[PDB]
Every structure is written in C-alpha cells, then in structure tokens.
Design an enzyme around this catalytic site. Structure first.
Site, short mmCIF file in Angstrom:
data_model
loop_
_atom_site.label_atom_id
_atom_site.label_comp_id
_atom_site.label_asym_id
_atom_site.label_seq_id
_atom_site.Cartn_x
_atom_site.Cartn_y
_atom_site.Cartn_z
N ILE B 14 0.88 -1.23 -0.05
CA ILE B 14 0.00 0.16 -0.05
C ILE B 14 1.06 1.30 0.06
O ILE B 14 0.30 2.29 -0.17
CB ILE B 14 -0.95 0.05 1.10
CG1 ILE B 14 -0.29 -0.10 2.63
CG2 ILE B 14 -2.11 -1.15 1.35
CD1 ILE B 14 -1.09 -0.03 3.55
N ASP B 131 7.90 16.48 10.76
CA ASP B 131 7.51 16.14 9.41
C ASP B 131 6.03 16.10 9.36
O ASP B 131 5.43 15.07 8.65
CB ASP B 131 8.22 14.83 9.02
CG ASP B 131 8.09 14.52 7.54
OD1 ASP B 131 8.18 15.58 6.74
OD2 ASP B 131 8.29 13.45 7.12
N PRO B 134 0.33 16.30 4.78
CA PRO B 134 -0.78 15.43 4.50
C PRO B 134 -0.73 13.77 4.33
O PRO B 134 -1.28 13.02 4.92
CB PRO B 134 -1.36 16.00 3.36
CG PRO B 134 -0.92 17.48 3.41
CD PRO B 134 0.16 17.42 4.11
N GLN B 135 0.37 13.45 3.80
CA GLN B 135 0.51 12.17 3.48
C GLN B 135 1.15 11.28 4.77
O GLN B 135 1.27 10.18 4.76
CB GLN B 135 1.42 11.74 2.37
CG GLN B 135 2.95 12.47 2.70
CD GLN B 135 3.77 12.09 1.31
OE1 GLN B 135 4.33 11.13 1.09
NE2 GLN B 135 4.28 13.33 0.80
N1 LIG Z 1 5.25 5.51 6.24
C1 LIG Z 1 4.53 4.97 7.24
O1 LIG Z 1 4.97 4.73 8.39
C2 LIG Z 1 3.12 4.34 6.66
N2 LIG Z 1 2.53 4.83 5.68
N3 LIG Z 1 1.08 4.27 5.70
C3 LIG Z 1 0.46 4.41 4.60
C4 LIG Z 1 -0.81 5.34 4.75
C5 LIG Z 1 -1.70 5.17 3.58
C6 LIG Z 1 -1.31 4.68 2.35
S1 LIG Z 1 -2.45 4.95 1.06
N4 LIG Z 1 -4.18 4.61 1.62
O2 LIG Z 1 -2.33 3.57 -0.11
O3 LIG Z 1 -2.47 6.72 0.54
C7 LIG Z 1 -0.21 3.85 2.25
C8 LIG Z 1 0.66 3.61 3.42
C9 LIG Z 1 1.05 3.64 7.06
C10 LIG Z 1 2.24 3.69 7.73
C11 LIG Z 1 2.21 2.95 8.90
C12 LIG Z 1 0.93 2.59 9.64
C13 LIG Z 1 -0.47 2.45 8.88
N5 LIG Z 1 -1.58 1.86 9.11
N6 LIG Z 1 -2.31 2.03 8.21
C14 LIG Z 1 -1.46 2.68 6.85
C15 LIG Z 1 -0.15 2.78 7.35
#
Ligand SMILES: NC(=O)c1nn(-c2ccc(S(N)(=O)=O)cc2)c2c1ccc1[nH]ncc12
Lengths: 257, 302
Positions: B14, B131, B134-135
C-alpha cells in the site's frame, strides 16, 4: 515553553522505569566497577574524538547499565557492549551519527563490524527498543530554566559534576537522575555563585536541600577527589574553553548544610 | 522472529519509499488486520536505521487515539518489521479525491481538532514530529485521524539542533527554520498543522515554495515581511537579509475565504511569526473555533 511541567512530570515518571538493578555488579561473575569506570571514561574520549553530544554519552551509559542488569558479560566483551551502546545512542540522539565502521575503528579492530552490528541487535532485544531514557543531562536542562541569572559557568560546572557521576557505579547507581541533577545543580551553583538550590526548583521538583543531602554529600566527595581519580577524561574535557575550564575550579571545603 | 512472521499473510503493498515498504497484512490466527512496514537491513549495512530507532522507541511511548499505534516489532536476521494498526488512507490522497467537492468544514474542524489532540500528547511527552504533512496523517472510515511516520521524530528532553540541511518538507517548513534558527521547538509542528489546516479549507497548498528562498518569500508575501516589532530577533537570525523585500500582511479573509471569525483567529495564531508566541496545541484546543466540534464520517472512495 508550557509543556515544561507536563514534561518534567513525565520524565520523573519514566526515570523510575528505565532504572537498572542497583546491585547488578555483585552478580556479574567477571566484571567490576573499576572495569566499568574504565569503559565509561573511554566513551567520554570517544565522544570527544567524534564530537558527540553529552546526551549521547549519558544515554549510552544508561543502556550499558540496563543491559548489564540482566546479562552476564565477560571482560573481553564489555567493550563490545559499550561500543554498541554508543552506536545506538548516536543513532538516537545525533543529527549525523558516526558510521559503524568508525565505531569499529575506535575499538582498534578488537571487534568486527559484524560483531558490533550483532551486538546492536542483542542490546536492542534486551532493552526492548526502549531507548528514549531520562538522563541527568535532561533534568539539568529543565533546571537551567529556573536559573534567575543564567550563568554559563554554573551550567558548565553542573554538567561536569553530572558527567562525573557516570563513572562510578558506586554510589551513583542508587540515585535517580533527577536527584543527581539536583545535587549537581546545587553544588555547581554554590561553588560558582554561593547561592543555593532555589525555591522555584524546590516547588518544581519537590526536592528540598535536605532530601538532596545524601546524594549531595556523595557528589561533593567525588568533586573533592576528582584530581586523584584513576579516570581523568572528564576533567580533561572540562578544562576546555567551551566549558570555561570549570574542572580547574576549586571545590568548596564544606557545603554548610 | 521467523515464527511470528509466518503468522502474517501479506494482503497487498500500500506504500513505498526509502524506508522500505508498507504492506497491508492479516494475522492468520487472530484475523486481525494490520499494517506491516518492512525495512531491509542489508541495504546499507549500517545496522538498524536511525529512523527505525526513533520511530519505534518514541512511538512505543505514545499511546493515544490520534497517534498511529505500533503493535509490534519483528527483528529477523535481514529484515526489521514494524507492525501497526491499519488505517485506510492518508490525508493527501483524501484531499485529492475531495478536490471537486472540497472537504466539509465540519470534518475539517474535526480533523484539526484530533490532530491537535495527538500533537499535544506528543509535545507533553517531549516528542517533536517534525514532518507533519498530509501524507503522514492517516484516516479511517469512522472519521478518525492519526499522526503517523515518526521516522524523523525526536525526543527533546534536551533541545534538538537544526539540521544544517533541513529535513521538514519545504511547503510545511516553519519560517524560523528557513531563517536558520539553532533549535527546533514545538512551534514548528504547529506551523505545519496551520499550513495543513488552510490547505484543507482552500483546496490549495498555502505556501508551495520551489526553493528555500521562494518558500520564505511566499510566506512573507502572505503574512507580511516580519520586523523586530512583530518578531523580536528576526533581523539577527543567520539567514535573514536586510535586503529582503518588505511585503505587507494580506487580509486573512482573502487568504482563507471560507473561514469565519474563529477559524481565521485560530489559523493566524498557528501561523504567528515569533515561535515563542505561536499558539500551542494545548491552547489551540481551547480556542472557540472548536466550540461545536463533532465527528463526521468521511466519504472515502476506497
Ligand atoms: N510511512 C508509514 O509509516 C506509513 N504509511 N502508511 C500508509 C498510509 C496510507 C497509504 S494509502 N491509503 O495507499 O495512501 C499507504 C501507506 C501507513 C504507515 C504506518 C501505519 C499504517 N497503518 N495503515 C496505513 C499505514
């Protein structure tokens, strides 16, 4: 700042948990307080060579003591534990930590890059990744805000006294960082400006000059004998200009408590 | 270690990045859905990465509804896995999908309210996110939002020195940082949140700079070029140049048109120039803007 209080309260909470077994050394079959002193003194040197923060040094000692509280280590591996501890503390606290290769170098190739990384894994396992430990350094930082006329020599001397406590497991292992910091702050403040543990910090910490006495008596003794101590890296480090050569200041004869 | 990993069923990738990869996975024995962040260690042969060291150690000390929960850590021979609760999507993806209709103000209020709760918790536990963008903000279908990605997070029991080469994403980087301040402070996180607040409201990034100087100027151009009166010490900061153009503070009602008096008040306090005066997450929560907050559920186009 206004998280100041919530943070002190939290650090006070956490220091009681990252606490190592006070009597672990008597249970170690092969290492002793003297060997530990030699190890910590060496870490101070390593810290000066790589220009690491004092916090890194304090964290490493905390890791080392906790690891030794539950793991028997032999003379020949004590340095490996210490090196891995320094490496982990660097990754945690430094902006740009030295590379593994560098840590292997300062051990004069006594150990392998592989051994050091293997030990890092083991230390992390034994400490269960709980690296954000409260240090004397952190408490001193919090106390420095309650310093009416902020004096740099007082800060340097308190740092010096606090750093000396890292060297001798006996008797400092039995005191909490916040208490050691309390004594270090008072003793430094008293030595440089003749003032004493401020009322504001009494209210903040709940520690009275009376409560700090036991630790204070010990720290004063260490301060007095510092020039005669077998380990000298800290005194040398603190006669630098960046610390206003406070290690050359004469300790008071009595604390008049 | 290898045993634990066997109990996990990878569902799908993901997310990716320098850290490694984030997969959605399922616990075969309990059925629990989870997020696995894989980190390859043989990639740079330097041991466990600083980012993992900081994310794990700090995150395991932060248990709060608005902070992503770290459920476990599996350290094999070559891989390090961080196991987290699972959330459906990040705020960036949601903002993009909401471009046409825009995110309803009630939901914006709810999200900002929760973000401040999680941030306040971080700060009162001496942790700086550093940091916030949004993402790195995760949301579920119930209307909850949580802070995530603590790879650049730092404990500040001892003041955190600023990177010679800054790390906070440009668009969300606080002015003190751009002007070369010596230490970070809780204020840089609040600033980021402010930029995010506005972005949700207008559907456009507040200060989308192309470079450090461009970033700085876009801020000056909107909030006015700061002077000793507005921010005592500005002119003395490292990267401050007296040759800086002197812009005037734009009218806030035109910067974030959809906001009311309260909304404009809060945002301006979050974008206050002097970090010592920039509002705290704790205080922000008490602001009248949240007087009527609620917990709306988002239309996630999963
Ligand atoms: N960098 C990270 O640590 C991190 N990145 N995501 C993450 C969030 C959204 C998407 S998406 N929905 O494809 O835009 C893809 C990956 C998570 C992270 C750690 C715990 C998580 N639980 N659920 C998602 C998630």
């Amino acid at each position: 700042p206004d998280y100041h209080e919530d943070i002190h309260t939290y650090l006070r909470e956490m220091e009681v948990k990252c606490k190592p077994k006070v009597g672990y050394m008597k249970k170690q079959p092969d290492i002793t307080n003297s060997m530990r002193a030699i190890l910590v003194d060496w870490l101070v040197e390593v810290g000066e060579e790589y220009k690491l923060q004092n916090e890194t040094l304090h964290l490493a000692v905390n890791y080392i003591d906790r690891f030794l509280s539950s793991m028997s280590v032999l003379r020949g591996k004590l340095q490996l534990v210490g090196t891995a501890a320094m490496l982990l503390a660097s990754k945690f606290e430094e902006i740009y930590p030295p590379e593994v290769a560098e840590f292997v170098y300062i051990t004069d190739d006594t150990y392998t890059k592989k051994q050091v990384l293997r030990m890092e894994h083991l230390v992390l396992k034994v400490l269960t990744f709980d690296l954000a430990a409260p240090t004397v350094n952190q408490f001193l930082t919090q106390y420095f805000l309650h310093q009416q006329p902020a004096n740099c020599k007082v800060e340097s001397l308190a740092m010096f006294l606090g750093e000396l406590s890292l060297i001798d497991a006996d008797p400092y292992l039995k005191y909490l960082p916040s208490v050691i910091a309390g004594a270090a702050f008072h003793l430094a403040l008293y030595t440089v400006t003749g003032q004493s543990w401020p009322e504001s910090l009494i209210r903040k910490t709940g520690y009275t000059l009376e409560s700090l006495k036991p630790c204070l008596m010990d720290l004063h003794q260490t301060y007095l004998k510092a020039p005669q101590h077998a380990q000298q890296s800290i005194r040398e480090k603190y006669k630098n200009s960046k610390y206003h050569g406070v290690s050359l200041l004469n300790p008071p004869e009595t604390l008049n408590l | 270690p290898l045993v634990d990993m066997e109990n996990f069923q990878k569902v799908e990738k993901i997310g990716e990045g320098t850290y490694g990869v984030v997969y959605k996975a399922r616990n075969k024995l309990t059925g629990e859905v989870v997020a696995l962040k894989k980190i390859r260690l043989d990639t740079e042969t330097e041991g466990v990465p600083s980012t993992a060291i900081r994310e794990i150690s700090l995150l395991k000390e932060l248990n709060h509804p608005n902070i992503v929960k770290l459920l476990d850590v599996i350290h094999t021979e070559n891989k390090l896995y961080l196991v987290f609760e699972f959330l459906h999507q990040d705020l960036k993806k949601f903002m993009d999908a909401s471009a046409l209709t825009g995110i309803p103000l009630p939901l914006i209020k709810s999200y900002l309210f929760q973000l401040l709760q999680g941030l306040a918790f971080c700060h009162s536990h001496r942790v700086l996110h550093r940091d916030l963008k949004p993402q790195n903000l995760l949301i579920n279908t119930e209307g909850a939002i949580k802070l995530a990605d603590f790879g650049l997070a730092r404990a500040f029991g001892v003041p955190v020195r600023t990177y010679t080469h800054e790390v906070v994403t440009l668009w969300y980087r606080a002015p003190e940082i751009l002007l070369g301040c010596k230490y970070y402070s809780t204020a840089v996180d609040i600033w980021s949140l402010g930029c995010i607040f506005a972005e949700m409201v207008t559907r456009r990034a507040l200060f989308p700079g192309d470079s450090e100087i461009d970033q700085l100027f876009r801020i000056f151009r909107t909030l006015g070029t700061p002077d000793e009166v507005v921010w005592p010490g500005v002119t003395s900061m490292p990267d401050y140049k007296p040759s800086f153009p002197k812009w005037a503070r734009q009218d806030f009602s035109k910067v974030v048109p959809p906001l009311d008096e309260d909304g404009r008040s809060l945002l301006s306090q979050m974008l206050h120039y002097d970090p010592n005066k920039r509002i705290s997450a704790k205080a922000a929560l008490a602001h009248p803007f949240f007087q009527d907050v609620t917990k709306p559920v988002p239309h996630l186009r999963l």
